JSON list of C-alpha atoms in Angstrom, two decimals:
[
{"chain": "A", "resi": 3, "resn": "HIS", "atom": "CA", "xyz": [81.25, 151.07, 104.52]},
{"chain": "A", "resi": 4, "resn": "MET", "atom": "CA", "xyz": [81.74, 154.40, 106.45]},
{"chain": "A", "resi": 5, "resn": "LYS", "atom": "CA", "xyz": [78.54, 154.55, 109.12]},
{"chain": "A", "resi": 6, "resn": "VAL", "atom": "CA", "xyz": [75.34, 153.04, 107.17]},
{"chain": "A", "resi": 7, "resn": "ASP", "atom": "CA", "xyz": [74.64, 149.53, 108.70]},
{"chain": "A", "resi": 8, "resn": "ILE", "atom": "CA", "xyz": [70.75, 148.53, 108.25]},
{"chain": "A", "resi": 9, "resn": "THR", "atom": "CA", "xyz": [70.66, 145.75, 110.93]},
{"chain": "A", "resi": 10, "resn": "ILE", "atom": "CA", "xyz": [67.30, 143.61, 111.17]},
{"chain": "A", "resi": 11, "resn": "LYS", "atom": "CA", "xyz": [66.81, 141.68, 114.39]},
{"chain": "A", "resi": 12, "resn": "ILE", "atom": "CA", "xyz": [63.23, 139.79, 113.93]},
{"chain": "A", "resi": 13, "resn": "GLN", "atom": "CA", "xyz": [62.14, 138.09, 117.58]},
{"chain": "A", "resi": 14, "resn": "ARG", "atom": "CA", "xyz": [59.88, 135.40, 116.17]},
{"chain": "A", "resi": 15, "resn": "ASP", "atom": "CA", "xyz": [58.10, 132.39, 117.87]},
{"chain": "A", "resi": 16, "resn": "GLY", "atom": "CA", "xyz": [61.14, 130.98, 119.60]},
{"chain": "A", "resi": 17, "resn": "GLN", "atom": "CA", "xyz": [63.58, 132.00, 117.06]},
{"chain": "A", "resi": 18, "resn": "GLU", "atom": "CA", "xyz": [65.58, 135.19, 116.55]},
{"chain": "A", "resi": 19, "resn": "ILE", "atom": "CA", "xyz": [66.43, 136.15, 112.77]},
{"chain": "A", "resi": 20, "resn": "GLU", "atom": "CA", "xyz": [69.44, 138.58, 112.43]},
{"chain": "A", "resi": 21, "resn": "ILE", "atom": "CA", "xyz": [70.26, 140.09, 108.85]},
{"chain": "A", "resi": 22, "resn": "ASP", "atom": "CA", "xyz": [72.45, 143.36, 108.34]},
{"chain": "A", "resi": 23, "resn": "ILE", "atom": "CA", "xyz": [72.78, 145.31, 104.74]},
{"chain": "A", "resi": 24, "resn": "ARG", "atom": "CA", "xyz": [75.88, 147.58, 105.81]},
{"chain": "A", "resi": 25, "resn": "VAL", "atom": "CA", "xyz": [76.97, 149.85, 102.73]},
{"chain": "A", "resi": 26, "resn": "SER", "atom": "CA", "xyz": [78.36, 153.04, 101.02]},
{"chain": "A", "resi": 27, "resn": "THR", "atom": "CA", "xyz": [76.91, 153.98, 97.68]},
{"chain": "A", "resi": 28, "resn": "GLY", "atom": "CA", "xyz": [73.31, 155.19, 97.22]},
{"chain": "A", "resi": 29, "resn": "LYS", "atom": "CA", "xyz": [70.23, 153.60, 95.83]},
{"chain": "A", "resi": 30, "resn": "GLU", "atom": "CA", "xyz": [70.87, 150.13, 97.20]},
{"chain": "A", "resi": 31, "resn": "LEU", "atom": "CA", "xyz": [69.63, 151.18, 100.46]},
{"chain": "A", "resi": 32, "resn": "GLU", "atom": "CA", "xyz": [66.48, 151.70, 98.49]},
{"chain": "A", "resi": 33, "resn": "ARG", "atom": "CA", "xyz": [66.21, 148.43, 96.56]},
{"chain": "A", "resi": 34, "resn": "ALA", "atom": "CA", "xyz": [66.82, 146.45, 99.68]},
{"chain": "A", "resi": 35, "resn": "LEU", "atom": "CA", "xyz": [64.56, 148.52, 101.71]},
{"chain": "A", "resi": 36, "resn": "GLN", "atom": "CA", "xyz": [61.68, 147.49, 99.05]},
{"chain": "A", "resi": 37, "resn": "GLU", "atom": "CA", "xyz": [62.60, 143.48, 99.44]},
{"chain": "A", "resi": 38, "resn": "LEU", "atom": "CA", "xyz": [62.75, 144.18, 103.40]},
{"chain": "A", "resi": 39, "resn": "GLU", "atom": "CA", "xyz": [59.04, 145.49, 103.04]},
{"chain": "A", "resi": 40, "resn": "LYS", "atom": "CA", "xyz": [57.81, 142.18, 101.17]},
{"chain": "A", "resi": 41, "resn": "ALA", "atom": "CA", "xyz": [60.18, 139.85, 103.90]},
{"chain": "A", "resi": 42, "resn": "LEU", "atom": "CA", "xyz": [58.30, 141.07, 106.68]},
{"chain": "A", "resi": 43, "resn": "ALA", "atom": "CA", "xyz": [55.12, 140.97, 105.46]},
{"chain": "A", "resi": 44, "resn": "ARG", "atom": "CA", "xyz": [55.72, 137.16, 103.91]},
{"chain": "A", "resi": 45, "resn": "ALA", "atom": "CA", "xyz": [57.23, 135.87, 106.82]},
{"chain": "A", "resi": 46, "resn": "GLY", "atom": "CA", "xyz": [54.77, 137.85, 109.64]},
{"chain": "A", "resi": 47, "resn": "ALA", "atom": "CA", "xyz": [57.27, 139.16, 111.92]},
{"chain": "A", "resi": 48, "resn": "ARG", "atom": "CA", "xyz": [55.27, 140.40, 115.07]},
{"chain": "A", "resi": 49, "resn": "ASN", "atom": "CA", "xyz": [57.86, 141.76, 117.50]},
{"chain": "A", "resi": 50, "resn": "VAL", "atom": "CA", "xyz": [60.99, 143.75, 115.07]},
{"chain": "A", "resi": 51, "resn": "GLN", "atom": "CA", "xyz": [63.95, 145.92, 116.17]},
{"chain": "A", "resi": 52, "resn": "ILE", "atom": "CA", "xyz": [65.53, 147.53, 113.29]},
{"chain": "A", "resi": 53, "resn": "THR", "atom": "CA", "xyz": [68.57, 149.48, 113.92]},
{"chain": "A", "resi": 54, "resn": "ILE", "atom": "CA", "xyz": [70.05, 151.81, 111.79]},
{"chain": "A", "resi": 55, "resn": "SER", "atom": "CA", "xyz": [73.75, 152.74, 112.53]},
{"chain": "A", "resi": 56, "resn": "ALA", "atom": "CA", "xyz": [73.59, 156.35, 110.32]},
{"chain": "A", "resi": 57, "resn": "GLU", "atom": "CA", "xyz": [76.35, 158.86, 109.40]},
{"chain": "A", "resi": 58, "resn": "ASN", "atom": "CA", "xyz": [74.87, 162.00, 110.70]},
{"chain": "A", "resi": 59, "resn": "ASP", "atom": "CA", "xyz": [72.06, 163.73, 112.77]},
{"chain": "A", "resi": 60, "resn": "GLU", "atom": "CA", "xyz": [70.05, 165.01, 109.21]},
{"chain": "A", "resi": 61, "resn": "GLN", "atom": "CA", "xyz": [70.61, 161.39, 107.73]},
{"chain": "A", "resi": 62, "resn": "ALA", "atom": "CA", "xyz": [69.17, 160.04, 111.36]},
{"chain": "A", "resi": 63, "resn": "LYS", "atom": "CA", "xyz": [65.92, 162.20, 110.95]},
{"chain": "A", "resi": 64, "resn": "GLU", "atom": "CA", "xyz": [64.94, 160.93, 107.51]},
{"chain": "A", "resi": 65, "resn": "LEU", "atom": "CA", "xyz": [66.24, 157.07, 108.04]},
{"chain": "A", "resi": 66, "resn": "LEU", "atom": "CA", "xyz": [63.89, 157.38, 111.33]},
{"chain": "A", "resi": 67, "resn": "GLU", "atom": "CA", "xyz": [60.84, 158.64, 109.42]},
{"chain": "A", "resi": 68, "resn": "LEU", "atom": "CA", "xyz": [61.87, 156.19, 106.38]},
{"chain": "A", "resi": 69, "resn": "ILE", "atom": "CA", "xyz": [61.36, 153.38, 109.10]},
{"chain": "A", "resi": 70, "resn": "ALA", "atom": "CA", "xyz": [58.23, 154.84, 110.75]},
{"chain": "A", "resi": 71, "resn": "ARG", "atom": "CA", "xyz": [56.73, 155.00, 106.83]},
{"chain": "A", "resi": 72, "resn": "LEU", "atom": "CA", "xyz": [58.01, 151.41, 106.28]},
{"chain": "A", "resi": 73, "resn": "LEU", "atom": "CA", "xyz": [56.34, 149.95, 109.71]},
{"chain": "A", "resi": 74, "resn": "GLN", "atom": "CA", "xyz": [52.92, 152.28, 109.29]},
{"chain": "A", "resi": 75, "resn": "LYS", "atom": "CA", "xyz": [52.21, 150.83, 105.73]},
{"chain": "A", "resi": 76, "resn": "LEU", "atom": "CA", "xyz": [52.60, 146.92, 107.30]},
{"chain": "A", "resi": 77, "resn": "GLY", "atom": "CA", "xyz": [50.33, 147.86, 110.64]},
{"chain": "A", "resi": 78, "resn": "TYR", "atom": "CA", "xyz": [52.40, 147.94, 113.75]},
{"chain": "A", "resi": 79, "resn": "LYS", "atom": "CA", "xyz": [50.93, 149.60, 117.07]},
{"chain": "A", "resi": 80, "resn": "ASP", "atom": "CA", "xyz": [53.52, 149.93, 119.61]},
{"chain": "A", "resi": 81, "resn": "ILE", "atom": "CA", "xyz": [56.63, 151.81, 117.93]},
{"chain": "A", "resi": 82, "resn": "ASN", "atom": "CA", "xyz": [59.14, 152.36, 120.40]},
{"chain": "A", "resi": 83, "resn": "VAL", "atom": "CA", "xyz": [62.53, 154.66, 119.85]},
{"chain": "A", "resi": 84, "resn": "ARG", "atom": "CA", "xyz": [65.78, 154.98, 121.52]},
{"chain": "A", "resi": 85, "resn": "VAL", "atom": "CA", "xyz": [68.27, 157.04, 119.17]},
{"chain": "A", "resi": 86, "resn": "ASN", "atom": "CA", "xyz": [72.33, 156.52, 120.45]},
{"chain": "A", "resi": 87, "resn": "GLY", "atom": "CA", "xyz": [74.10, 159.67, 118.92]},
{"chain": "A", "resi": 88, "resn": "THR", "atom": "CA", "xyz": [72.71, 158.72, 115.19]},
{"chain": "A", "resi": 89, "resn": "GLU", "atom": "CA", "xyz": [72.14, 155.05, 115.92]},
{"chain": "A", "resi": 90, "resn": "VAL", "atom": "CA", "xyz": [68.16, 154.57, 115.53]},
{"chain": "A", "resi": 91, "resn": "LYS", "atom": "CA", "xyz": [66.59, 151.53, 117.19]},
{"chain": "A", "resi": 92, "resn": "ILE", "atom": "CA", "xyz": [62.85, 151.13, 116.16]},
{"chain": "A", "resi": 93, "resn": "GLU", "atom": "CA", "xyz": [61.29, 148.22, 118.34]},
{"chain": "A", "resi": 94, "resn": "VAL", "atom": "CA", "xyz": [57.54, 147.66, 116.97]},
{"chain": "A", "resi": 95, "resn": "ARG", "atom": "CA", "xyz": [55.41, 145.16, 118.90]},
{"chain": "A", "resi": 96, "resn": "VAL", "atom": "CA", "xyz": [52.25, 143.23, 117.36]}
]
């Protein structure tokens, strides 16, 4: 996979739900991101840590704003970022 891990921790009412989509290709990041938008809205995910394990600093910039474009479309108030070098964790709390 090189260094591209799309890691979704949903913290729910009494349960954590973790799913990782780690890939080196092109376009499967976008196809998974469209069904993940639909899955967060269909389940009702109130506290979500999306951690994107990214390859470089310019990739980490537009992956940071792709996660903000995703979570501002759903409607999340408490958008808490920490970047570990390139690894972008965004914690969103309803």
